[PDB]
Design a protein around this nucleic acid. Structure first.
Ligand SMILES: [Cl-]
Length: 349
RNA sequence: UGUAUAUA
């Protein structure tokens, strides 16, 4: 009749008016794994202002932790006790699940409990959770679920305590490549770039530079490179802008690497933009200047447009004096009218 | 005219 109870309450939730948490004492597991009972627990926890009601079920939560954390409805019940305002309970709760954290990190509901704990609890408990992640970190970083736990770790824990995550990006020669071209691993790389110290990220970026071409034009790798441009050193931007400038047409005409140039133009210094415009207007002795060839391309026309929006009036004037002759012919090409229309603002001198 | 992340 525990089951009949929850049938009663799915029928007449009016009969849940006068019902409090301490009353389901003993039936917590059935309630928390039920859609209606889980909502009752959650709502009661959020509206009760009686600490002793909430404490009365806590021992049942701690005892059934392992069965609630990867349950479709139970995982919410567990997360409610990782709230700000239940801090007396964080340690007991972390202890109920610590030994199975290497499994929970891969599971689609329990990994939400781990992300909540990392969001709310204090640094020693965070580190205690991370200590278990160490055991599975490489598989975890590439997992659809585990990578969110790792990303959350990186946002919420001080840089020094995720050195082992950086050390995992640098495990082997090709690990940074393998992660950058992986749909989940690449988010971990990006989180590291945004939040680790420059001493931590320097060997990461250096690994990225070694296979820069391949990562830049990868559907996930290009966002890794974009993050390097934004969070890397001035010497990284110089190395990157020097490379794209030397190969401006090749990077500009590929689907993924063309976003890399756009990022250089948005983050780059006047000196950086000058290299890119300078490469774009180079009078290649027997062919059209590559800024005109770029405007004929399916991806690179978005790049030329980014130059006009991002460079200095002086530099823009070099673009205009280079592109003005070819405007007849450019209107012919696919979308050439739309491409030049969006540029009309600049050619009405 | 061109790109990405797990719950009722
Ligand atoms: Cl290497």
């Amino acid at each position: 009749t525990t089951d009949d109870l929850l049938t009663r309450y799915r029928a007449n939730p009016a009969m849940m008016k006068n019902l409090k948490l301490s009353d389901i004492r003993g039936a917590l597991l059935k309630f928390a794994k039920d859609q209606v009972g889980s909502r009752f627990i959650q709502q009661e926890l959020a509206s009760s202002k009686d600490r002793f009601e909430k404490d009365s079920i806590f021992d049942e939560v701690v005892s059934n932790a392992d069965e609630l954390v990867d349950d479709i409805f139970g995982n919410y019940v567990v997360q409610k006790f990782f709230e700000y305002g239940e801090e007396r309970h964080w340690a007991r709760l972390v202890d109920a699940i610590i030994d199975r954290v290497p499994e929970y990190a891969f599971q689609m509901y329990a990994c939400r409990v781990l992300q909540k704990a990392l969001e709310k609890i204090n640094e020693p408990l965070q580190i205690k959770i991370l200590s278990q992640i160490r055991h599975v970190i490489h598989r975890c970083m590439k997992d659809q679920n585990g990578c969110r736990v790792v990303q959350k770790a990186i946002e919420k824990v001080s840089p020094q305590y995720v050195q082992f995550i950086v050390d995992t990006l640098l495990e082997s020669s090709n690990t940074i490549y393998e992660m950058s071209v992986d749909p989940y691993g690449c988010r971990v790389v990006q989180r590291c770039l945004e939040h680790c110290s420059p001493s931590q990220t320097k060997p990461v970026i250096g690994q990225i530079h070694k296979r820069f071409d391949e990562i830049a034009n990868n559907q996930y790798g290009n966002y890794v490179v974009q993050h390097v441009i934004e969070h890397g050193s001035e010497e990284d931007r110089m190395v990157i802008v020097t490379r794209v400038s030397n190969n401006l047409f090749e990077f500009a005409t590929h689907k993924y690497s063309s976003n890399v140039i756009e990022k250089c133009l948005e983050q780059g210094a006047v000196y950086h933009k000058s290299m890119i415009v300078g490469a774009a207007c180079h009078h290649q002795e027997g062919s059209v200047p590559i800024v005109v060839q770029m405007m004929k391309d399916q991806y690179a026309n978005y790049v030329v447009q980014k130059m006009f929006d991002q460079v200095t009036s002086e530099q823009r004037r070099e673009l205009i004096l280079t592109v003005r002759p070819h405007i007849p012919v450019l209107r012919q090409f696919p979308h050439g009218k739309h491409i030049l229309a969006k540029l009309e603002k600049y050619f009405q001198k």
